[PDB]
Amino acid sequence: QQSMIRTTRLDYKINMMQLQADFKFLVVKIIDRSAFKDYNKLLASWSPEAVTSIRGRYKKGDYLMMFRQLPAIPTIAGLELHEILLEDMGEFKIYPNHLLQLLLNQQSANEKSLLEPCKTPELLISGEEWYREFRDMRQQYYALKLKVNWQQDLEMSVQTFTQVTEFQWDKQIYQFDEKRGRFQLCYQPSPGIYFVQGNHSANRNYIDFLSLQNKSSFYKSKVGVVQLVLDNLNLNAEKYLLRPVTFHKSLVEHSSRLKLSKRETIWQQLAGSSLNIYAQVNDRLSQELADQLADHLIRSQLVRKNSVHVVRSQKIQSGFNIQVIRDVRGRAAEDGYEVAKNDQIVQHLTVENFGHYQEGDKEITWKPKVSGKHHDPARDVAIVKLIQELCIKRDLANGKLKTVEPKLASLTQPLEFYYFAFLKKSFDPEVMVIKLAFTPEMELRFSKKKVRLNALTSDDEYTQVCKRVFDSLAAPKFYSAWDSVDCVVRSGNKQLLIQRLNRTIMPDGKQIRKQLELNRPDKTLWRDKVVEELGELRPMVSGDSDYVAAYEQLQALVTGMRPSFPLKDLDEAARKAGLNPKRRDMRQVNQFLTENATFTLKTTLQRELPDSPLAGMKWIGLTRIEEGEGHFNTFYFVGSDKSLKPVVNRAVTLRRLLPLAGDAGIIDELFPKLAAMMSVEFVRSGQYTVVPYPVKYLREYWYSILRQHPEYR
């Protein structure tokens, strides 16, 4: 099969002539910063259809006004207002993307909506679900800001709004339009409750990416809200777009579905070794946690099966060493953090974060997650991660590569990985270029060199690689640019650049909406209509004995209930009759109903299917986005190996594969190796790692240097 994935990039073509015929456009220059008040007064006076913000590095405008009927253009000092034509829209650097922004700004969150005029430059969507109150009854919504950037990528960033009682003439004031379910700018004092951007409370606000619990829950997520808005826009503004707004479709090239290992198989490296559990002296709170953890580890079957000796001493011994300390990083206190010596491997854990101690408790309350067939305390994710970090620190200190299996190490040896860190607190722009090389004996060969961006004419390998990365980066002046780049994998003269981006993977939201509509619980059904439909669909079943038997049982079950019923009644009747969706026969019936019937008891979303709408969120693959004409930009994604849970909190970002040196075949020949390195368990607990695993070694090695060189911290 061929998997299809769609990113945040949009495909659309605005029907320019119809838009020009139905509207008049105005461009507002703002020269004087004090003239913002006059501009706000003008906006309060007028009533435009939509407003977007033209702003570029070569400024020829500051706002675009979409007017159904152009008003009398006035003359105000500090503003230049002049009606333009869409054929001359290139004169003010108005690309065919602020027009889609206007049409987006006219939209609404509600299903089956129309083009309602609006004056807010940005589309901020918030309902009643994304709302909470404080002890001062400060209403604090948080919306979902939608915006199409200069490269036609949709951004869905979360915007949080707080409540203010009185109008602020110097700050921006926002008012919640409850009917349209979206925030709006307030230019004049208005009845209602005012809002301002910001979130100063302790807890953050996260909007779920997508949820498959049901259609109602799906509509209150990033993907669901985006789908609602896109479908609305594709419907009400049918004339204005020659082609509908759809996310750009792309083909996966190198799909990798390597299964991970059980997280608790890391104790094999610890076989026939010792763990010296000890804590910070004269601190009872850490001592009891250390004692409890040591006792759990001793009694654990996995520890006792692998022949691992766990002892609770009072000081650091040779070999592995887990330390328990009070976190004194923030305020002033004695530093219980002990730095490891020559042959000692230390891995500290605090009490506040690891032991889950909030300020006030008299004693520890840490309880390892022992869920499973037989309860075992050496299987918790935190303990496994501690052991994995101990194994990695052992590799770093010993200089040998021994925690990566023996077959993956052979495939990784002939490749060299560079690491970059923009050296802050340096007058001259300087970057530290680390380089990890592997000897044929699987030995680490870290070797760095400080490189100045001004003096890039040197001919060493570090200077060459830094110069090549320097050219590719958009804004090398800042440090976030150098933070975006992960590593530069090198194979001889070939060099490949891995860089993080902001474009994420979007699932096929339309198909998810269509299926969840079929599986909608409160969907009323007609007994006669459903019976007739199932009778007509009977010939198409043609499966095995149990499948057809379950289909006939469901067909005969429908007649039992009342002439009309919600789908929940049918679902409960099937469940009581023994049609558990987990069964093999009922699953095929559910799939058949999803593909062909107007209803389905269970939806085949979490199932692994040849063409799933959840493509790109589950496996590792490589994509080739056009990004214009002939550049053939290459990207890849990393998804969760396990089956997706009903909710997915975070999207999956797209890294970039830019060949600094060599031809285009560098990607096609090195990507399988990178994917093989990315299928590891120690770097990321229970998941794939987005970047190759030697990036973890480089990051740990650089942190070790930072521990001794405050000049680079």
Add this chain to the structure above:
DNA sequence: CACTAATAGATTAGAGCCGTCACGTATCAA
């Protein structure tokens, strides 16, 4: 008994967060 007065945005850049490290159950291979 008393107020008047009369008020940068927009867009990135980064520190630091949470939150996810999957679990109990039917089910085909070996």
Add this chain to the structure above:
DNA sequence: TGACGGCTCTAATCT
């Protein structure tokens, strides 16, 4: 100092 990694507020940059 479980740690990775997306990403959210917020100080910074930029007129």
Add this chain to the structure above:
DNA sequence: TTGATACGACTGCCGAGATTAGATAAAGTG
């Protein structure tokens, strides 16, 4: 006779109106 691999993880209801007698109970001045 058990060690895999693919998928389940279920939230309720949804106002108006009309009739009584019932110790109490502080601390003020423009």
